[PDB]
């Protein structure tokens with residue numbers, strides 16, 4: 001039997017537009033749904049139902065069978081309400097898609113209308129097929145919580161027979177400590193080390209240090225700026241007065257470990273920025289308050305993406321989200337350095353996760369990029 | 374007897390209890406709704422009726438339809454009156470309550486649609502190659518059956534529908550192709566936009582000039598070459614929608630011109646899923662892009678014009694990119710797939726661009742088409758400071774309230790200049806200083822600035838801007854042999 005679920009007081013169901021899907025994805029969904037209906041998981045709905053949720057198809061990690069993916073982000077923000085600090089230290093964590101379990105459980109009959117979704121038709125030639133779940137749907141925040149007492153009750157023997165291995169559940173996934181979080185390192189700021197220094201060199205250095213001082217105010221560039229006194233040729237080599245060598249040293253030392261007083265407050269949003277460096281390289285930072293980074297990282301594109309910036313980004317975004325969950329138990333809000341339409345058009349092509357983080361689009365400043373590589 | 378659609382009212386509300394305005398089997402209780410002549414005012418009820426799933430708000434593009442040997446349209450009479458109204462929800466319609474979907478009610482169009490879809494479903498299962506398109510009261514039915522077999526099939530449809538109380542026009546009273554639908558002229562083997570008659574007047578008012586420009590655009594969808602610029606100067610400063618504006622000497626030119634272009638007829642062919650999709654894009658003037666999509670050389674399915682300044686400072690590459698993104702988005706909607714592109718930019722130009730741009734940017738499978746004008750990059754900022762080139766340390770600053778500023782520089786070679794600006798902004802003075810360094814320097818320069826703002830604009834390699842000043846800076850940059858811009862913190 002079903003457990004009564006509800007939308008937050010006074011709120012109503014989601015009426016989010018369905019984005020255009022390719023023929024391939026429409027046929028795919030149509031085949032998936034036709035059988036889901038046959039198994040009573042989903043059932044067609046009439047016009048009396050005004051709600052809606054976006055849907056699309058993806059292909060899991062190295063699999064060739066399609067996976068229906070429902071963007072319940074809106075429904076999740078309106079669903080009434082109901083972390084292993086050791087997981088991040090583990091040597092090897094594995095991600096198990098245990099999303100199918102949810103189907104065995106029925107969903108409150110009163111809540112179903114809010115799970116409505118539409119499968120579009122090419123060129124609007126037809127009204128589209130409308131369904132609504134009759135069971136706990138994949139990707140909804142209600143499902144993991146409801147199927148909780150049940151999920152534990154089945155993982156009661158394994159964590160008692162093996163109370164060493166850590167089991168963490170986030171949405172449709174299961175993390176058992178394939179990740180290797182004991183190797184995750186934070187990108188520390190790094191000043192250049194060179195035989196000779198030109199005026200230009202020292203300028204860039206002074207620049208980075210100015211910025212760096214926003215996080216580390218102990219940093220002093222007084223001596224270095226004197227070596228800049230005067231209006232000289234950029235290419236003019238400048239020997240370092242010893243007063244500077246020492247000034248450069250302290251800074252280096254100051255930047256050998258993260259800034260102090262940087263704790264994680266689970267009552268605040270987790271934010272993530274990404275910068276495109278080039279050569280298929282991508283930097284990112286996770287924080288909650290400006291300059292107080294919880295983590296800074298680096299991402300190298302995987303093969304079969306050399307020619308595709310969007311794939312790289314989406315792959316990077318998923319890489320970064322996985323780290324968020326594996327560390328804090330939450331997904332961050334992304335600041336994507338990409339034009340919204342470019343992204344909204346192809347992200348679903350390189351996506352493989354079952355959760356969809358929140359995002360927004362920015363205009364990365366030139367300077368900040370010279371400072372993070 | 375078609376299944377009934379259950380319907381309630383918005384939580385915490387009750388049926389309309391609006392008094393009757395004094396006046397002179399489809400209908401059989403504290404409610405009432407205004408009725409007179411038989412037109413009912415359900416405005417109140419509608420404001421009480423729940424919400425339903427949207428009606429077909431997106432219509433199909435002819436470009437994306439497949440050729441049919443024969444096509445027919447059937448208008449469904451008394452459509453709404455032919456469908457039963459939720460037995461329970463009936464009371465709220467009293468005025469005498471309804472037993473059928475009321476004309477003018479909120480959920481009528483929707484419930485009807487839903488009903489028609491369910492009635493059609495069976496007949497559809499049995500007739501997989503007979504395509505039916507529902508559009509309000511109309512049923513467009515096309516098939517690949519020969520003239521007679523088709524008629525026989527339409528007759529089956531009519532009967533199936535008749536089983537459900539839905540009556541339709543027999544073969545004698547049906548309207549025959551081509552179909553004039555939403556500004557189009559549909560033939561079973563080709564399409565186009567309905568007739569475009571440019572008025573031949575000698576007294577044009579604002580309303581005439583706007584409607585004209587209105588018709589002109591809608592045609593550009595298939596008639597590439599039309600122009601509206603020399604007519605769209607005729608509206609400038611217009612005092613009223615009846616002010617008669619005399620067509621300038623150049624205004625009669627463009628018109629006569631279009632008038633001639635519109636004389637030659639062009640038809641759009643239909644879509645063939647067995648062949649590939651291809652879009653070619655041309656740079657039609659600064660900021661204007663054209664394109665045509667086809668499967669066979671010159672047999673365009675759809676063509677179009679783009680002119681959108683995505684901001685204030687851009688270039689042809691970024692502009693080329695966006696055009697591709699819009700064409701891709703249309704393509705996915707219309708055909709369900711991305712066409713292969715034929716673009717006027719070399720692989721190496723595009724490579725150099727996306728590889729070093731700070732924003733993720735991508736273009737689906739495409740190939741260079743050598744049709745001038747090609748889109749290129751007008752200048753490349755040096756990646757490292759230039760040896761032997763003079764160095765300009767520039768600076769600008771303006772008081773944000775007096776709008777008074779100064780901009781100038783000082784080079785390693787003793788050159789210096791300070792200019793006073795008026796009615797300027799800080800940003801503008803920062804740009805101005807860079808401008809000056811560029812003006813007064815040789816073919817090779819090293820420029821140091823403390824303006825992140827200017828540094829950002831310029832590093833993005835703009836080649837077109839709204840800012841006269843930015844445009845002068847581009848011109849200079851295009852002339853330089855080498856330009857290395859470098860930042861330094863201010864103060």
Ligand SMILES: Cc1cccc([C@]23SCCN2C(=O)c2ccccc23)c1
Pocket residue numbers: 433434435438439440441444445504505506513514515552554559560561562
């Ligand atoms: C969107 C729309 C409007 C009217 C008629 C149709 C129509 S009638 C049936 C569906 N359509 C086709 O496949 C077709 C092909 C050529 C002419 C007409 C048609 C489609």
